[PDB]
C-alpha cells in the first residue's frame, strides 16, 4: 500500500518543490518514475534501504531522499518545465522484482 | 533498453491481442508485463524467465524466444476492459525493473 500524498502539484520555474511517498507493510526499497507519453515508465533514482539513494536512469535534474523506509522523497530544487510529466513513486523487497506503484502526483511546471 | 512493436492498437471484443517486445542486455532474466489502467497506476501481470518459452495465467499468455531477444504476451478473448497501456518491463537484479516504453490497446465491443 504505497501512498502518494498530493495528486495536483505545481510549480514556477526554478523553484524548489519535493514529491514525498509512504509505504505501510515494509517494502525495504523503494522507487522514483515519471511517466512521459512517448517512453514509458522511465526511472529516476532510488533507494536500497532506510538511508540510502542511488541513481536511476533519468539522475540530474532531481534529488533523492530516503529519510527512514517507510517515507521516500524526491527534491526538485529548481524547477523546470522540462520535468512536468507524471511521477510515480513504487515500493518492493523480493525476487521476482514485484514493484507496487502508488497512485501518482501530477506536476506542472508554470513557467513557459 | 526495452522496445515494444505494438503502440497503440485496438482489437474487437474477440480476437487475439498480441504485443511484442524486445530488448538486447544478455545480462536480462526474468521479464514481467505490467498494465496501466487508464488514470490508474501500473500493476504487474504475467511475467516469464528465459528458463522457459512459455507461461499462461488465463488468456493472458507469454511467448519468449531466446536470441533474437524477442517477447511478446497474447491477451485471448480481447475484452473491453483489458484495455490499458500493457507495459513489457525486463531485468536481473532482484527487484528493479528497466521498462519498456508500453503499448496503449482499448478493445471496442459490441
Known amino acids: 500500500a504505497v501512498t502518494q500524498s498530493p495528486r495536483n502539484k505545481v510549480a514556477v520555474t526554478g523553484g524548489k518543490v519535493t514529491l514525498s511517498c509512504n509505504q505501510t507493510?515494509?517494502?525495504?526499497?523503494m522507487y522514483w518514475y515519471r511517466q512521459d507519453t512517448g517512453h514509458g515508465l522511465r526511472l529516476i533514482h532510488y533507494?536500497?534501504?532506510?538511508?540510502?539513494?542511488e541513481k536511476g536512469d533519468i539522475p540530474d535534474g532531481y534529488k533523492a531522499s530516503r529519510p527512514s523506509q517507510e517515507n521516500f522523497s524526491l527534491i526538485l530544487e529548481l524547477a523546470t518545465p522540462s520535468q512536468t510529466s507524471v511521477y510515480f513513486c513504487?515500493?518492493?523487497?523480493?525476487?521476482?522484482?514485484?514493484?507496487?506503484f502508488g497512485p501518482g502526483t501530477r506536476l506542472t511546471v508554470l513557467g513557459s | 533498453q526495452v522496445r515494444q512493436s505494438p503502440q497503440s492498437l485496438t482489437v474487437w471484443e474477440g480476437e487475439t491481442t498480441i504485443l511484442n517486445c524486445s530488448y538486447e542486455?544478455?545480462?536480462?532474466?526474468?521479464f514481467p508485463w505490467y498494465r496501466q489502467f487508464p488514470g490508474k497506476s501500473p500493476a504487474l501481470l504475467i511475467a516469464?524467465?528465459?528458463?522457459?518459452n512459455k507461461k499462461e495465467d488465463g488468456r493472458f499468455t507469454i511467448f519468449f524466444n531466446k536470441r533474437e531477444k524477442k517477447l511478446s504476451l497474447h491477451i485471448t478473448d480481447s475484452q473491453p476492459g483489458d484495455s490499458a497501456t500493457y507495459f513489457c518491463?525486463?531485468?536481473?537484479?532482484?527487484?528493479?525493473?528497466?521498462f519498456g516504453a508500453g503499448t496503449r490497446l482499448a478493445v471496442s465491443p459490441y
Open positions: 513504487a515500493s518492493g523487497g523480493q525476487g521476482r522484482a514485484e514493484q507496487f
Open positions: 507493510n515494509n517494502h525495504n526499497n
Open positions: 533507494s536500497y534501504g532506510a538511508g540510502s539513494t
Open positions: 542486455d544478455s545480462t536480462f532474466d526474468y
Open positions: 516469464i524467465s528465459l528458463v522457459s
Open positions: 518491463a525486463a531485468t536481473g537484479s532482484f527487484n528493479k525493473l528497466t
